[PDB]
Structure formats: C-alpha cells, structure tokens
C-alpha cells in the first residue's frame, strides 16, 4: 500500500485550505522531514513572512508527530511558537492520503477546516482527483497557487 506522507521523509507542501486558517502575509509554506526518534517524526515548518521582512528571509518551525498504522489520527507535538501563533493543534483527522498527498481536517470544529499538502511531483499541477476531494471536503477551500519564488534556486 502507500506510503503515509507525514511520516516520511519526502517535503510536503501547502496547496489549499479553508479561509477561516488564513494568515495575511504568510507564504511559501512547506514542512521538511528532519529526522526520527521512536514513533516521532520531527520536521520543520518553513514559510515566508512578508510583511518589513527582507525578501530572502525563511522563518522556521519546528513540530513532531505520531502516526499509528491505520489510525484515522496524526497526532501532532508542535512548538510553542508554532501552537501560539500558527494554530495548531495536537491532533488532525486523516481524510485520506497517497505516496505524493495528503488531506487533513480540524477534530474540533463541526464545520472542520481542512488542509491540503502534496509533495514537489503536484507544486505546479494537482491531479483533478485530488482537486475533487479537496473541494468537496472541505468548507471555503482556497488553493495556494503556484509561485517559482517559493523554491531553492530561481
Ligand atoms: C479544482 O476544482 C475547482 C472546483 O470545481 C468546481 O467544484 C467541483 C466540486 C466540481 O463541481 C467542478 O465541476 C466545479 O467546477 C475548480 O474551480 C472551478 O473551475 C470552473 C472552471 O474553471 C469555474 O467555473 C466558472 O467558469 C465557467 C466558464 O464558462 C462558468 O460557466 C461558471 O459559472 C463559473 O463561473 C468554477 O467557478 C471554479 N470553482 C471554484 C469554486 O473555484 C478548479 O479549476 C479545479 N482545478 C484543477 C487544477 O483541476
Ligand atoms: C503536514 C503535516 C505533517 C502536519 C502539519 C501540522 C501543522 C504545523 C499545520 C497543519 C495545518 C497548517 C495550517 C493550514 C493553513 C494555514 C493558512 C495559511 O495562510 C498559513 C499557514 C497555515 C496557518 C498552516 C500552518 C501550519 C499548520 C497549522
Ligand atoms: C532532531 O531534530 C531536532 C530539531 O533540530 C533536534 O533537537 C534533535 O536533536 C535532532 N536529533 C534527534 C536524533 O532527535
């Protein structure tokens, strides 16, 4: 079967969520694998703060998390930083996943926000099926669209 994303060591990037998460000036968001230790997974969270901040400037988060096989939950350990001011939460409901996707939801909230994160094979191209669920699932989805800026190099 497929690879779970999450715990895998393939960068994972932001390509649509619902408008209620947005955040005014933040860009570029993505995760990197780091490393791992027992069933934690630790990454970081890279994105762009573009207001009176220098152009080539990365912030960085950093946040652990737990995948069981099979379990509908992704359990999430984050940062001080990143729980304060990025919202997240410990733990995030798995809609579904694939080698090169994955979809999450709010536990919480009966109108759950969602979250759609693809690796670098769908940045510039998201297959209509995942586009599909994407819409359908979750509440005032808003793509991320594709910028060349948000990458090493060019
Ligand atoms: C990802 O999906 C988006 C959502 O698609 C819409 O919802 C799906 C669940 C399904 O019902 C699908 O058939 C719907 O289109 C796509 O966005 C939609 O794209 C439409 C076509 O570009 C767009 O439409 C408008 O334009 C036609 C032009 O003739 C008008 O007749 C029509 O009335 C609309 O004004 C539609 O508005 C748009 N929806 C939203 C909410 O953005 C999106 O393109 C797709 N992306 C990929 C990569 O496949
Ligand atoms: C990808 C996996 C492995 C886990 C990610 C967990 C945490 C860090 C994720 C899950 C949902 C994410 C949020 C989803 C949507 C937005 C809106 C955007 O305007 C700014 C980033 C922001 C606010 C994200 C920040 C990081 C976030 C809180
Ligand atoms: C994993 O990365 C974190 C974050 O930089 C670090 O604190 C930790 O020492 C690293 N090493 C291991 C094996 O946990």
Redesign the pocket.
Known sequence: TPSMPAINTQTLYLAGHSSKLFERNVGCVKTRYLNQTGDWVTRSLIYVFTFDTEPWVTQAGAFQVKWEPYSPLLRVKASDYVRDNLGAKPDYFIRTYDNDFLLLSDLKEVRSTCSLWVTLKYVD??P?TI??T???ICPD?V?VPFDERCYPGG
Do not use: D, H, V
């Open positions: 191209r998201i209509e586009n599909r994407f819409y359908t989805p793509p």
